Point group: C3
Chain length 490, copies 3
């Protein structure tokens, strides 16, 4: 002789945060943040990266004799470099526009080394005495591999005139250099002429260099210096050289065969023989969630980065404002396993739990729609990129550093605020549905039943399981049971 | 004998989107996105722009013999330049700090050309014979028109000392240059002196230049090069020149008569003899909408730019919820309902007809109207993109500039879309509650004198004419006077 | 017989704004925007700042004879410098990499000046004739105090070879310079040799300089120029000099003893004897509010800067979707009620008095405060502006810097105003729901023993005293015990 309505409860212990409350327990939830990595360096889509162990970019390109296992390299997906490489320019000096060169290296996937000037093209100079103790090889003085140090022969240094014509179909990378001597006497011992120069000219290049003879402090046990330069040669251009002395000549060059997407990564983790689709300087990520907090700089197809600790979305009602879930209904039911809103009946034939599948489905579609919307709306988000600056560009370096942290905080704020508000609306949405269900039954049985305070109703007239289906379907005939009602209400 | 409550509906098919639902049909809506353009270039508030057809900025300042239609130029509003101009420095070379000069040129709206150093000032050098085949004019050798190339006369090149003292009350722009020779023999053929120099000095400038002699590849048929420099002279300063050879001397200069706001646009569209108030590289914009999606770079008064495809607001009821009235115990709207969003249908014995609830429609009208205005005002301040240029060796800075401007357009696009989704959700429920409140207001006044059907209508126990049913819509329904009569019929 | 329902009211006149409506009057509201400053410069945390009165950073480091008040300085917290320092570089010239030096100075809190090259280490050269009328001192020619201008003694200028080794366990700052003559004749008078050079070399430095001789315009009273350079010498490193003319030798250097956080401020305000925790160029702020609108650039712990004019958070309900309770079906509030926000008034035969409801006012107060704290917590991290300087030929980079920090301020301003406007709308709803939810509880329990009247209160046909009728606030009522006589009470 009773019909009652309620909601479904379970053993869940998930907890979400709203604007006005924290640690609220819900029946069903799913996390959307990734916090784990494998702690290794692994292949990107089946292509091994290029790992420069203890060499800088300059040491590899100029051919530092100490680390020369990189004489020939296959294709690479990205470049890995340590924080402070040990083997760099061995003879003290510098490389002009070092940072601008490394920006070019981030868009190249393959190099090919070719020989452009054989050593036989220096008949009137000495090509075998350019060794130095600052660049040792197996305990003996040596020098760089891709360049030649020319000194006088038979007490003379005739002027040099040479040219190269690019006949390939790709661009070339060329490097040369100049030497700064110590004193006037040392200048004549190496190159006979007392005043020297170097001039280089292409279709867009025009240069002249003069040595600086002065006194400097010892670096690696030497007081001399060497400066290096580079350029890109077009497929049908030519380059011309001319010098009197202090010249470091090119021997080998690089062809740019494949152009693509890559990065230079600073890390110290070991190679681990894997395959993956997302890589970070601290490890690899394998997940399908839309957010992660591992590291700001990544390569590949990755989830977006936020500086958060947790991000949980609620997909169920409050576990056990229209005042229905908390009030008029003390708590949920464990017996109603199937649905989310349902009925409980008390009858002479028996009792049981029944669920309203129609209203249950409407809620599932409504919330699943919302969840897929949050993933979509955050598709476009700031992606960090690495840039480098030298010691006299501190102003620009600071400007770059603040711009990237500025966007990181904006998107972290947006993600955290969005989760908080949608966790609140979901809980109100579930509450409203149960309130509307209560009214639907109430309007049908206008006077044939009385309210019992809680969700239950007690019937004036006697009925069996049949008209239980009538009320829940809405097919309750008020005039049919109009009699047997006034008699009870005596 | 019977009264009922309902809401207004029509035949519109406009659709909007909320956070929880998509393709929801509404009675009324509003669009806030502009997606059309003229496809032409027009005057900005009545000032014609300056079109450099196949001529670069450098080819216009230094007078390239081909770009001779720009000798005299009136006032302009903005400058239009093609992507890859054909006519540029004809003789091979470069212009120092080209990008910084273009940044300065974006704040100037008029110029005037004056003759600072007449050609009679050089009586011991050859003013003619400075032509070349790299700069042709009507099939004959020529040279830049705003500078002069000086060559030896009578096998001698005396040293030059000259000065100019600004007295025009406005700033001046001056250009000069140096020539690099091919070989040693060429140097003596033209200038007669083996070693040369150029020195220029002002209150803030101290410069010395030396030619470089080397072998270079052919460009435009010539292996020589020419480099040019520029400076700005304050209203009462002076400039001093001294040279031994290889000197390209100034002849004309520009006065900065007018200053203001301008820009340089890269486009290929054609002039349309029209007028406008907003201009984009792809066309002009006529609209009053808050947002647009034509192009990120604009000039003039313009709506804000977003990278979206549709933005529709909702200002009406859902057409055929949280408060369970619009689609709950009220099944649907009334087609015959006009003159009001919410109202009552009356069906007494004297007659039957519809009616409208005044002062319930009006509050909803005022409520939604203020919501729209607040959204427009809150988005007045938005990031505006501006063009900048960098050379081949500034790739790191150029990359940094591009990422900054794309980052801000992503943020503001996210803000605009989120606001529209949320306010649409509130508006739908705002209409839902107002119907529910009206339904409850009648139920309390009526009390037990009527029996509620359960569909949104009430059936009167006591017979009541249009006068007392008008009193229900007054809210002056007098329960006691009809209370006793309804009793007897109740049984 | 009567027990009505109502809500608390007072005489407040605070106003808040929502999305739907502006100037809503509420009982209690907070303010979270600070708008006052003292207008003086104070000590940051008990450390007085360094105030350069009429000098520049260059004038202080290279001792300008006028700026002799700053010969020895104590530890500072930040540096104050006027807009256009009058005393700067008495002898016309320039300082190389000026802006990069100032950026380095922003992370230093203390210097110590030491002597490295005594005057006695210059025999065979003249050390007392290097004075000029451009640096006047007490109306008699003088020169910078940290460098020496060397002139020929007898009629010769022997070459110089000097070296210094850093053995101080701390980094050093060293300055030197070169002099550009006016004429060949003037060159021989000061230094006998006609062709000169300067060579400087460290572990990471390799430089060579040559004078430029030309005619220039008069700045101050002189046509000569001087160029100065600087470097940082790491511990256990040496610097080597060599020249034969036009050399401005170092005499004093600065040690870097304390590193930390500092800044350089462009202000014209005056020093007042006070200490603070936040400092702006306009004044000092002393408050606990979350936001402020004084100035973008600050130092110390400070509220976040926004560009708004008013940020008021509503905390109490309005004073005399929308659940119909507060403004409808309950006309106005109660002035007499003071104990809580919501409560029950009663009128028994014995007397009439107001009462209060706990567990309801408690949850409303608990809810509102949690919302306020979460707003403040969510704004913990926000963009903070820093100062940077660029010279005259870096206009593109300077414009880029301005647009970036302007864009971030508009983004964070938008978030603050949007967050407030939405929570104001939600809060006024929250009180409305509580009023109606209470009304359901009382109506539900008195199912038929009471006759609802529609004004918010119930009339019991039945009679019982304060022990029972008031016993309904506790939530305990026995329907059966009073059902019989209520049923027997019929007409
Ligand atoms: C105290 C003293 O004078 N000692 C002499 C040695 O010089 C000392 O040791 C070297 C390592 C430096 O630290 C010196 O500063 C120091 O005083 C001297 O060794 C030779 O000194 C000369 C000085 O100019 C030079 O450094 C020599 O360098 C070589 C080298 O690297 O070993 C020799 C190479 O063959 C040569 N390569 C050529 C010719 O292409 C170069 C070249 O000389 C310079 O690099 C040019 O800049 O490097 C160094 O060996 C010793 C003689 O063996 O005599 C000691 O009395
Ligand atoms: C050597 C050969 O096979 N051909 C000779 C011509 O040179 C060839 O054609 C020219 C266009 C270039 O491509 C050369 O590289 C090529 O070998 C030669 O023509 C003259 O060549 C000289 C080379 O220096 C020079 O280019 C002359 O060009 C002019 C010019 O630009 O038009 C002539 C002008 O009158 C002169 N102007 C002044 C102020 O004197 C300029 C100027 O001297 C230079 O630009 C300075 O850098 O040069 C070109 O006519 C031909 C005649 O000698 O002989 C062919 O055998
Ligand atoms: C009309 C005329 O010719 N007047 C001569 C004076 O020059 C005039 O006034 C000076 C201030 C300048 O404005 C000149 O451009 C102007 O014509 C001349 O005064 C001296 O002129 C010389 C050369 O032009 C030089 O500036 C002198 O400057 C001094 C100074 O400041 O007083 C003199 C110092 O002793 C000297 N210091 C050293 C270390 O030598 C420097 C000087 O600048 C150095 O030579 C470095 O450049 O400063 C200036 O007094 C006057 C001399 O008798 O003759 C007038 O006929
Ligand atoms: C580099 O080699 C190219 C390629 O052969 C040469 O330029 C050629 O010049 C000849 C002369 O008429 C012509 O075949 C073409 O103008 C060029 N060749 C091609 C295939 O286009 C020249 O030797 C060098 N070019 C430069 C610019 O130095
Ligand atoms: C440019 O000429 C003007 C006008 O002669 C110079 O300005 C001053 O003019 C007054 C007026 O007689 C005189 O004191 C001098 O002729 C000038 N004095 C000064 C201090 O400049 C100006 O000198 C000239 N420009 C320069 C820098 O030489
Ligand atoms: C500055 O002087 C110090 C102390 O004399 C020098 O350091 C010594 O250098 C020599 C030669 O390299 C070594 O044998 C000593 O062991 C060093 N002593 C110490 C305490 O480091 C230093 O080299 C000098 N500076 C320079 C760059 O010449
Ligand atoms: C929420 O619950 C977790 C789990 O114990 C706890 O660590 C955290 O402090 C709680 N937060 C609050 C505000 O109680
Ligand atoms: C990623 O994780 C999934 C789930 O365990 C697994 O099936 C897949 O093999 C993993 N891929 C890699 C490359 O580790
Ligand atoms: C909404 O309507 C658009 C346009 O008619 C259609 O392309 C889209 O698939 C619809 N979305 C859904 C969820 O039906
Ligand atoms: C711009 O649009 C309006 C209508 O929006 C139209 O009346 C007007 O003629 C158009 N052209 C100009 C120049 O305003
Ligand atoms: C309706 O109410 C108004 C009071 O606002 C009154 O003036 C008017 O006479 C009423 N109409 C009828 C028919 O009673
Ligand atoms: C709200 O009231 C203030 C106080 O007088 C007034 O300045 C402001 O204009 C009012 N705003 C509106 C929208 O009425
Ligand atoms: C700021 O104001 C408070 C409260 O009036 C006061 O106690 C405090 O001393 C003030 N701070 C300073 C630095 O004067």
């Amino acid at each position: 002789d009773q019909i009652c309505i309620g909601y479904h409860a379970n053993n869940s212990t998930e907890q979400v945060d709203t604007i006005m409350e924290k640690n609220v327990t819900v029946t069903h939830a799913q996390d959307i943040l990734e916090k784990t990595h494998n702690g290794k360096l692994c292949d990107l889509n089946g292509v091994k990266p290029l790992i420069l162990k203890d060499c800088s970019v300059a040491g590899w390109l100029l051919g530092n004799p100490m680390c020369d296992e990189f004489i020939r390299v296959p294709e690479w997906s990205y470049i890995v470099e340590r924080a402070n490489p040990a083997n760099d320019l061995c003879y003290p000096g510098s490389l002009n526009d070092y940072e601008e060169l490394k920006h070019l290296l981030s868009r190249i996937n393959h190099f090919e080394k070719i020989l452009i000037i054989p050593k036989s093209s220096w008949p009137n100079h000495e090509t075998s005495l350019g060794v130095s103790a600052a660049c040792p090889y197996q305990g003996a003085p040596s020098f760089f591999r891709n360049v030649v140090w020319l000194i006088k022969k038979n007490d003379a240094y005739p002027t040099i005139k040479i040219s190269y014509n690019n006949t390939n179909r790709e661009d070339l990378l060329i490097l040369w250099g100049i030497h700064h001597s110590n004193n006037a006497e040392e200048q004549t011992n190496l190159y006979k002429n007392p005043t020297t120069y170097i001039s280089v000219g292409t279709s867009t290049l025009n240069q002249r260099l003069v040595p600086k003879i002065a006194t400097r402090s010892q670096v690696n046990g030497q007081r001399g210096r060497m400066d290096f330069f580079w350029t890109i040669l077009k497929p049908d251009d030519a380059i011309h050289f001319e010098s009197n002395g202090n010249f470091i000549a090119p021997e080998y060059a690089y062809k740019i065969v494949k152009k693509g997407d890559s990065t230079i990564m600073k890390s110290g983790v070991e190679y681990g023989h894997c395959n993956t689709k997302c890589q970070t300087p601290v490890g690899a990520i394998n997940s399908s969630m839309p957010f992660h907090n591992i590291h700001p700089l990544t390569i590949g197809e990755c989830p977006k980065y936020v500086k958060s600790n947790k991000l949980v979305l609620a997909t169920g009602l409050r576990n056990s404002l229209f005042g229905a879930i908390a009030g008029f209904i003390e708590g949920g039911w464990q017996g109603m396993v199937d649905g989310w809103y349902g009925y409980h009946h008390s009858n002479e034939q028996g009792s049981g739990y029944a669920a309203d599948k129609e209203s249950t489905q409407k809620a599932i579609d409504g919330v699943t729609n919302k969840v897929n919307s949050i993933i979509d709306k955050m598709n476009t988000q700031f992606e960090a990129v690495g840039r480098e600056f030298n010691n006299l560009e501190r102003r620009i370096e600071n400007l770059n550093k603040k711009m990237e942290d500025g966007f990181l905080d904006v998107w972290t704020y947006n993600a955290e605020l969005l989760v908080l508000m949608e966790n609140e609306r979901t809980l109100d949405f579930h509450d409203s549905n149960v309130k509307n269900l209560y009214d639907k039954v109430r309007l049908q049985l206008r006077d044939n039943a009385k309210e019992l305070g809680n969700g239950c109703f007690e019937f004036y007239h006697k009925c069996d399981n049949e008209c239980m289906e009538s009320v829940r379907n809405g097919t309750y005939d008020y005039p049919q049971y109009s009699e047997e009602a006034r008699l009870k209400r005596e």
